[PDB]
């Protein structure tokens, strides 16, 4: 259960912390899909 | 789906777009949980 609690920035960004990036290996410039999940009430971030 | 493709920002930040924020009420300084979901291979952002 790899997870970390973070603060939302002024311009509504969320940092994906190092702990999570060991599993979800994103870099500045990558494209990701950001979806509101209507059954879980969470936001999902998926790699393209 | 309520979703948008976004580019990862410098310093590993991902914008939660306005389209998504209409459903997922977040404000500057809110604390959120960032989780890797192994069943799906995606990151989930959860309100705390």
Residue numbers in the entry:
A (entry chain B), B (entry chain A): 2 to 49
Question: Please, what does the article write about this entry?
Answer:
Sso7c4 appears to be the first repressor-like protein described in crenarchaea and may play a regulatory role in gene transcription. The Sso7c4 protein possesses a homodimeric DNA-binding fold that forms a swapped β-loop-β ‘Yin-Yang’ topology, and it belongs to the SpoVT-AbrB superfamily. The dimeric Sso7c4 protein, which consists of eight intertwined β sheets and two flanking α helices, forms a dimer via intermolecular associations between β1 and β3′ (the primes indicate the second monomer in the dimer) and β1′ and β3 in the flank, β2 and β2′ at the top, and β4 and β4′ at the bottom. In our study, Sso7c4 exhibits DNA-binding activity and alters the trajectory of the DNA through bending and bridging.
Here, we present the crystal structure of wild-type Sso7c4, which was resolved at a high resolution of 1.63 Å, to obtain a better understanding of its architectural properties and functions. The crystal of wild-type Sso7c4 contains one homodimer in the asymmetric unit and is in the P212121 space group. Interestingly, the two basic C-termini are disordered owing to a lack of corresponding density. In the wild-type crystal, Sso7c4 makes extensive contacts with neighboring molecules via residues in loop1 (R11, N12, and Y13), the α1 helix (K20, R22, and K24), loop3 (E29) and loop4 (E39). Three sulfate ions, which all bind to the top surface of wild-type Sso7c4, are present in the crystal structure. Two (X201 and X202) are located near the R22 (R22′) side chains, mediate protein-protein interactions, and are solvated by eight water molecules; the third (X203) is close to the β2′ strand on the DNA-binding surface. In contrast, the R11 side chains in the wild-type Sso7c4 crystal structure are stabilized by intermolecular interactions. In addition, the R11 side chain (chain A) of the wild-type protein is further stabilized by PEG 400 through water-mediated hydrogen bonds. The K24 side chain is more ordered in chain A, which is stabilized by polyethylene glycol 400 (PEG 400), similar to the stabilization observed in crown ether binding mode.
